[PDB]
């Protein structure tokens, strides 16, 4: 399935290459650009447990999940991963605890120590 998928050819984003955050890309977004620290996201997200689990999207409520790129307002894995997409991009990563939920994890949804999917969308951002 797809989260084995990036364990087993992703790309290591992470600046440690601890394989904290792997990505695949899927779609092409367009151009070069890329949001800068600070900018406002909007993505579109579907996020598995990797053994399969569904446990949130954001297609489900069509409500694109906004937040301000490298504050610390998601997980970090995306932060680092989402600076990292151009609009339109669709991209897989795969989420070690360290860089998600950790040991106390995210009851229910998410257990202590969860590798976590997402199917990302950046659908747009901005300065503001």
Excluded at 25 to 30: A, D, I, L, P, Y
Excluded at 69 to 98: F, R, S
Excluded at 117 to 123: A, D, K, R, V
Aim: charged share 30%.
């Amino acid at each position: 399935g797809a989260p084995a998928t990036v364990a087993e050819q992703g790309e290591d984003i992470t600046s440690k290459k601890d394989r904290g955050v792997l990505k695949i890309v899927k779609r092409v977004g367009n151009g070069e650009e890329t949001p800068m620290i600070g900018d406002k996201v909007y993505v579109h997200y579907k996020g598995k447990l990797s053994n399969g689990k569904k446990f949130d999207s954001s297609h489900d409520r069509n409500e694109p999940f906004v937040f301000s790129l490298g504050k610390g307002q998601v997980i970090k894995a995306w932060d680092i991963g989402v600076a990292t997409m151009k609009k339109g991009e669709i991209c897989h990563l795969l989420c070690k605890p360290e860089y998600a939920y950790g040991s106390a994890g995210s009851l229910p949804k998410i257990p202590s120590n969860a590798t976590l999917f997402f199917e990302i969308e950046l659908l747009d951002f901005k300065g503001e």
